[PDB]
Enzyme design. Structure first.
Site, PDB file in Angstrom:
ATOM      1  N   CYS B 127      -4.108  40.458  34.166  1.00  0.00           N
ATOM      2  CA  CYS B 127      -3.946  39.043  34.298  1.00  0.00           C
ATOM      3  C   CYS B 127      -2.962  38.667  35.418  1.00  0.00           C
ATOM      4  CB  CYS B 127      -3.469  38.479  32.942  1.00  0.00           C
ATOM      5  SG  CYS B 127      -2.352  39.597  31.979  1.00  0.00           S
ATOM      6  N   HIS B 251       0.854  32.860  32.250  1.00  0.00           N
ATOM      7  CA  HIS B 251       1.835  33.603  33.039  1.00  0.00           C
ATOM      8  C   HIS B 251       2.269  32.786  34.251  1.00  0.00           C
ATOM      9  CE1 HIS B 251       0.845  36.956  30.622  1.00  0.00           C
ATOM     10  NE2 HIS B 251       0.083  37.648  31.456  1.00  0.00           N
TER      11      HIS B 251
END
Ligand SMILES: O=C(O)[C@H]1CC[C@H](C(=O)O)CC1
Ligand SMILES: O=C(O)[C@H]1CC[C@H](C(=O)O)CC1
Ligand code: NA
Ligand code: NA
Lengths: 357, 359
Positions: B127, B251
């Site tokens: 990710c 994130h």
């Protein structure tokens, strides 16, 4: 002994200034607590003694030997010069006087020598800078510093007591009331004085203080300019990204440096371990590295994750953590006061270099 | 239409795989949900339909056209090669096959071309890498990339359902019960497989995955190695520090680059805005920048705080945020599946290039 005044006694830093003074070796004959008009007449402890809080005014500083200011830049700008006129030595936590060339900007482990020529005001740097200086000075001494790139992970208590309460409330609303974080109402963070406010709960806000003209925030620019002044080297390149995260106390920093000469990692680790105020916590085989939650309550600055860059011969990465209200503020201030005492520097300044009002 | 299997349907990524497939254009005739013995026999919805969860086995893939794996590296190692042998095209979220020269490692906006020569397994990068690639590819295209230094601010959902629950539990113990963060008991974070566990509540843990022999963690080294493969340029210097913070989803990354040619910031902002999958959120006069809480639920990657280094002529700093379960995982996977469909690439692979582990 000394008469010591704490200006901003009721605030987040002030509460830690009280604790650090209670735990200090300073010979204190009289303690005074000062804040705003709305706090006057209230009572706070010094050890077992009841101290009545006083309003901060231009005439409140007669007979004071040392005053520790952490009541916002406005309050230092207004009253610190009157304190100096009254014969006080001021240790200021605010940003107001930091870049004044008549004012030493001190981290005692790094540039205590700058205290000797003080003119009645000594400035404490910002938290984020202080911990970085404690980590990096022992490296600079041996291998030099060409540049620093730092990304911070800053706790909310740096923004004051209200920011702590705002953070706790927001987290409770999400966890207990099922409010989506993007739907939370904020009043303080990222910056109390700026136009818009955003939730911190389950967020990372890349804004501390307000924006300057060059699109870095004042917090980022303070890391740049304060580093240069403390290390007495304008040639050190410093660029910062300063980010608030959902932590109440202790700032963490991912710090990249390039040294002037190649600095062997085992020697870097040993130099940091050996430096007063810095503790090496670096044993990856046992998952040992600095952690915010472990740093809370300690005066030390903790350094780990030390490793060479994968490509840049002289590049080194590390992780630096310290309690932002202790070494980042109140402990740095009390340590300065203790250093002034050690060096016989607690006495009135004859020449007034700071404009009144 | 296709028969599509979701392997790991019950996990944090799997729930988003389901959502992304429900919202997909893919022509789906049949959906199957696969997981472990733990969940086998339970039911989950696909739209209004009840789907019985099946235990994943080496013989579970007959008739499957596309299988999306997000059930941990060991599950992909064990079963993806059997899926390929059965005629499936596998899109794998795990790290297992990412560095295999016979496996395209794809972010569709960056290197969709690599799908054409697939051998039955296409890997999703991690990710943290995916969102960085979406932000930086439009810059690389115009001005090149010499180096990257990145510090991450990673959400706990990347570590799975258990990690989300652990984080919520810890925060409740502190905020509702008055437990000191130091006194919290942790079982999963920072890394489920490692020897010691630490609280994440009110903390920042500079460890994601386990340590490698060079003292960087596997997460940090994945950012390095995956960047080089996706951008097809081993000369790009990349070093990372990967940190878990108390965020459930999305994130954030503080990204520093040095370009090959000087890249004017106003032109950089325009290039990123123009790049598919990247959205410019950068207006500091109105305190506009990417934020994890705003990125949750969006397939886009958000970029701001874009500014030149104070000293390095070719240095640029920025802030990159994306939902780690969407573009970071399930949306990247479904997007790859859609891209395979668009290109006529959903069909069996004749030659098996992956070892069978269950013989
Ligand atoms: O001392 C200073 O210049 C600032 C005071 C507020 C601090 C914060 O909001 O964390 C940052 C540093
Ligand atoms: O996809 C991978 O290689 C990793 C899986 C776990 C992720 C996490 O723990 O946030 C990090 C990336
Ligand atoms: Na030391
Ligand atoms: Na390069």
């Amino acid at each position: 002994g000394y008469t010591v005044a704490v200006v901003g006694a009721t605030g987040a830093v002030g509460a830690q200034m009280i604790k650090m003074l209670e735990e200090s070796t300073l010979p204190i004959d009289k303690i005074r607590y000062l804040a705003s008009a709305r706090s006057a007449g209230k009572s706070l402890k010094f050890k077992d003694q009841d101290i009545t809080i006083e309003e901060t005014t231009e005439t409140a500083f007669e007979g004071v030997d040392i005053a520790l200011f952490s009541a916002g830049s406005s309050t230092s700008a207004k009253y610190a010069p009157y304190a100096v006129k009254a014969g006080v030595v001021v240790v200021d936590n605010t940003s107001y006087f930091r870049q004044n060339p008549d004012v030493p900007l001190v981290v005692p482990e790094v540039n205590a020598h700058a205290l000797d020529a003080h003119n009645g005001i000594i400035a404490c740097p910002n938290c984020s800078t202080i911990q970085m200086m404690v980590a990096l000075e022992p490296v600079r001494q041996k291998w030099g510093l060409d540049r620093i790139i730092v990304s911070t992970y800053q706790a909310v208590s740096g923004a004051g007591m209200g920011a702590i309460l705002e953070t706790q409330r927001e987290l409770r609303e999400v966890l207990n009331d099922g409010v989506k974080p993007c739907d939370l109402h904020a009043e303080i963070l990222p910056s109390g004085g700026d136009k818009k406010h955003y939730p911190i709960a389950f967020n990372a806000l890349p804004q501390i203080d307000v924006f300057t003209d060059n699109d870095y925030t004042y917090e980022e620019m303070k890391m740049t300019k304060e580093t240069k002044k403390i290390m007495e080297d304008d040639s050190i390149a410093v660029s910062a990204t300063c980010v608030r995260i959902p932590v109440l106390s202790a700032h963490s920093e991912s710090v990249y440096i390039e040294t002037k000469e190649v600095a062997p990692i085992e020697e870097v680790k040993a130099a940091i371990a050996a430096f007063p105020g810095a503790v090496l916590e670096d044993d990856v085989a046992h998952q040992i590295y600095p952690q915010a939650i472990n740093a809370v309550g300690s005066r030390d600055t903790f350094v780990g994750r030390i490793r060479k860059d994968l490509d840049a011969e002289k590049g080194i990465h590390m992780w630096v953590v310290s309690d932002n209200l202790l070494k980042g503020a109140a402990w740095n201030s009390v340590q300065i006061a203790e250093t002034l005492h050690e060096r016989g520097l607690v006495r009135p300044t004859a020449e007034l270099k700071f404009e009144l009002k």
